[PDB]
């Protein structure tokens, strides 16, 4: 009978969601003028990797970015001058994530080892060394992010989000309320709470302090491949395996408006907002990226310079550049 | 016009270019294999003849070839999300047990293994990477209902699942009590390298 009770609760929650859907973000912003066609050029290309790259993350200074390849390497690129600060060799090549700590001292990576190796970049010995190896997952580790210099958050193929603790190496909390897999997560500018993706076409709003999902968003269709909050942490744009970027709301608890184009039928693998939030750059399974106006739902300049699937991208903290990394082993800085 | 410090920084960045290039060069001579199959359908015994909680990278050598055999059995997640991770693999060693039609594990193990082989062989990533079928565990195996004819029919049923002219499935039959499973893989890998070099020449 509990299944029927759950169905009734779902019906009442969706009725409540519909009761607060007077506007669709397209009836509004008509008076707002459209953004001019954004022309973006490859300012710098980072041709150092040798195989597919599955993640990149910008430092707080917006000058250093760490990328993970299948060569078995993390590389800490100097974005402004295309220099390799650190070439971290991994124990196991199959890595599918990165995380540059808010302090430039710590980095993380691990995708199929079930473990997010945490590397220390500021050591008296002068070489990057594995500061920790967190082993508590039973599936591929899709994404990991840093809250502080310690106390990271990871999501793995075993349908769990961790919230590790670097000093002790143990599960500080655990986020097990997820029916399907998880592929990517995004943490708020204030790290009190974050969200995680899925493979059951949903996104969950996890609270870091007390482990639970405060809100769930199942309006999407096929899969989730990337998440990123709106700056100020109120609306996370979601990835898609059906070429449909969407941004939900933490307060309205519902989807605002879907971003789709019948021209392209592919799967997003990475989404990141702009600094102000007008742009919603998404790297598609279409050998390129795209720029979406976050308020008019329209399209903008297409950023096509890649040879394979665009696997990662991130707008800098100061919002100056947007580097994208694809399976062609080339990180391209776009400004 | 770079400063004294930034010239040294560029020297370091160029000196770890050489190390990375050498690491990539030394990691391309070896050949990577992806080991797949049904649930414990002769995987463990074959892996034993060749030589956490996720991949198991067996790392062996034979006749100057360096085989890196990645076994993925600890992954309880969907194969779709991490299957493209092995796109640049030389061959996929598909282990299947002949004593599988008797068991049921609704659908018998033969039907499940055959459907899974079809799904793997028709993945868009593995449209050019060849399959090495190991028809292992043939001792318990036993138109005509004799051992050889039924075994040949099973081989044909497995081999019929490809639909590309540039993809070749290599089959072999073992009693799981022999040392030939490295030689068979070596011969198949030599054939795969020969075919890859032929298609690189432009003549198919």
């Amino acid at each position: 009978q509990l299944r029927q009770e759950a169905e009734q609760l779902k019906n009442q929650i969706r009725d409540a969601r519909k009761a607060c859907a007077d506007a669709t973000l397209s009836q509004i912003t008509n008076n707002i003028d459209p953004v001019g066609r954004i022309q973006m050029r490859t300012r710098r290309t980072l041709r150092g990797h040798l195989a597919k790259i599955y993640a990149m993350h910008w430092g707080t200074d917006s000058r250093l970015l760490v990328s993970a390849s299948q060569d078995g390497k993390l590389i800490i690129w100097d974005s402004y001058t295309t220099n390799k600060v650190h070439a971290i060799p991994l124990r196991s090549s199959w890595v599918m994530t990165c995380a540059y700590a808010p302090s430039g001292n710590y980095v993380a990576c691990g995708g199929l080892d079930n473990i997010c190796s945490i590397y220390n970049l500021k050591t008296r010995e002068g070489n990057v060394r594995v500061s920790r190896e967190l082993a508590g997952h039973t599936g591929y580790l899709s994404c990991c992010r840093f809250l502080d210099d310690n106390q990271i958050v990871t999501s793995s193929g075993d349908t769990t989000c961790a919230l590790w603790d670097i000093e002790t190496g143990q599960q500080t909390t655990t986020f097990t309320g997820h029916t399907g897999d998880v592929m990517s997560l995004s943490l708020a500018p204030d790290t009190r709470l974050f969200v995680s993706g899925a493979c059951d076409a949903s996104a969950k709003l996890w609270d870091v302090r007390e482990g639970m999902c405060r809100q769930t968003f199942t309006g999407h269709e096929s899969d989730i491949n990337a998440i990123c909050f709106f700056p100020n942490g109120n609306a996370f744009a979601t990835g898609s395996d059906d070429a449909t970027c969407r941004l939900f709301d933490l307060r309205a608890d519902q989807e605002l408006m879907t971003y789709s184009h019948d021209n392209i039928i592919c799967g997003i693998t990475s989404v990141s907002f702009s600094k102000s939030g007008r742009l919603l750059l998404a790297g598609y399974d279409d050998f390129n990226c795209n720029v979406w106006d976050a308020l008019k739902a329209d399209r903008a300049g297409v950023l096509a310079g890649h040879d394979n699937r665009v696997s990662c991208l991130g707008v800098t903290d100061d919002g100056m550049a947007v580097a994208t990394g694809s399976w062609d082993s080339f990180l391209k800085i776009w400004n | 016009t770079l400063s004294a410090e930034e010239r040294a920084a560029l020297e370091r960045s160029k000196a770890i270019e050489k190390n990375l290039k050498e690491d990539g060069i030394s990691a391309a001579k070896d050949v990577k294999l992806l080991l797949l199959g049904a649930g414990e359908s002769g995987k463990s015994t074959i892996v034993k003849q060749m030589k956490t909680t996720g991949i198991v990278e067996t790392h062996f050598t034979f006749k100057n070839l360096h085989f890196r055999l990645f076994d993925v059995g600890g992954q309880r997640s969907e194969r779709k999300k991490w299957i493209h991770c092995f796109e640049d693999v030389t061959a996929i060693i598909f282990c299947v047990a002949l004593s599988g039609y008797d068991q049921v594990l609704t659908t018998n193990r033969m039907h499940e293994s055959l459907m899974l082989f079809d799904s793997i062989c028709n993945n868009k990533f593995f449209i050019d990477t060849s399959i090495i079928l190991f028809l292992n565990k043939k001792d318990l195996f036993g138109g005509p209902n004799t051992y050889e004819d039924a075994a040949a029919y099973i081989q044909a049923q497995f081999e019929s699942k490809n639909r590309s002219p540039n993809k070749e499935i290599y089959c072999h039959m073992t009693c799981a009590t022999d040392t030939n499973n490295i030689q068979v893989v070596f011969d198949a890998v030599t054939d795969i390298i020969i075919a890859n070099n032929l298609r690189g020449c432009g003549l198919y």
Partner: single-chain antibody, 232 residues
Framework: DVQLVESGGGLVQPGGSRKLSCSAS????????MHWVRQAPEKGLEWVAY????????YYADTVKGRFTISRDDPKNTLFLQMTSLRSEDTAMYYC??????????????WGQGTTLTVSDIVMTQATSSVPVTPGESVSISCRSS???????????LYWFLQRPGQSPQLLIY???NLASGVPDRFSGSGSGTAFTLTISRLEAEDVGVYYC?????????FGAGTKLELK
């Protein structure tokens, strides 16, 4: 532990030769650039030589180029300075210095001990050679550069070093905006592209050693005269 120890602590006849070997164990020697820094019976501090991470980038002080030859080996983690044609002015106690050059790195982190020996170019000045100050009071040390030391890249390659009395100096501030590892927060430096000033709030009895200033725009590196702090 991390340390660099020296070997050749012996008297040398004038017009001779010697070999100084220093061994380091704590860090990854092959990934560090290495320097050499001289001294004298006087408080003078002067640059000697340099070798890069890959041993492919060698520089020298223009006052002695062609007399000292520098080298190093990674298998034994040992850095060598072969001294040829020693004069009377070569007397010093040679410090070995590690320095790794990448964005955000701090060159000149660790200075090992040294063997005492007995027998254009940017110029920096520090007029306040003696600052008698009691503990607990803020202290200001000024260093002046002859060339605009603010490069076009936004960095200012200035280094401030402290030396405890009778100890190897430790780097205090690099680029007059960042503090070295382990340096107390009370230290603080700043300045324009020509003048540089420290603000040592809450001076203690440990912060008494002599201070040196260094420019780093060009490898013809020049140290500044020391500003000894006393208890008068």
């Amino acid at each position: 532990d991390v340390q660099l120890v020296e070997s050749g602590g012996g008297l040398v006849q004038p017009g001779g030769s010697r070999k100084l070997s220093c061994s380091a164990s704590g860090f990854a020697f092959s990934s560090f650039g290495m320097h050499w820094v001289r001294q004298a019976p006087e408080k003078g501090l002067e640059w000697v030589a340099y070798i890069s991470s890959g041993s492919g980038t060698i520089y020298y002080a223009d006052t002695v180029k062609g007399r000292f030859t520098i080298s190093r080996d990674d298998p034994k983690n040992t850095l060598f300075l072969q001294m040829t044609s020693l004069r009377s002015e070569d007397t010093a106690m040679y410090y070995c210095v590690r320095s790794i050059y990448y964005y955000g790195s701090s060159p000149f982190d660790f200075w090992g001990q040294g063997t005492t020996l007995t027998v254009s170019d940017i110029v920096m000045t520090q007029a306040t050679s003696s600052v008698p100050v009691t503990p607990g009071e803020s202290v200001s040390i000024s260093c002046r550069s002859s060339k605009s030391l603010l490069h076009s890249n936004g960095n200012t390659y200035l280094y401030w070093f402290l030396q405890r009395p009778g100890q190897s100096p430790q780097l205090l501030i690099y680029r007059m905006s960042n503090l070295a590892s382990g340096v107390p927060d009370r230290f603080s430096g700043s300045g324009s592209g020509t003048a540089f000033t420290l603000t040592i709030s809450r001076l203690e009895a440990e912060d008494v050693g002599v201070y040196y200033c260094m420019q780093h725009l060009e490898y013809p590196l020049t140290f500044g005269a020391g500003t000894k702090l006393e208890l008068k």
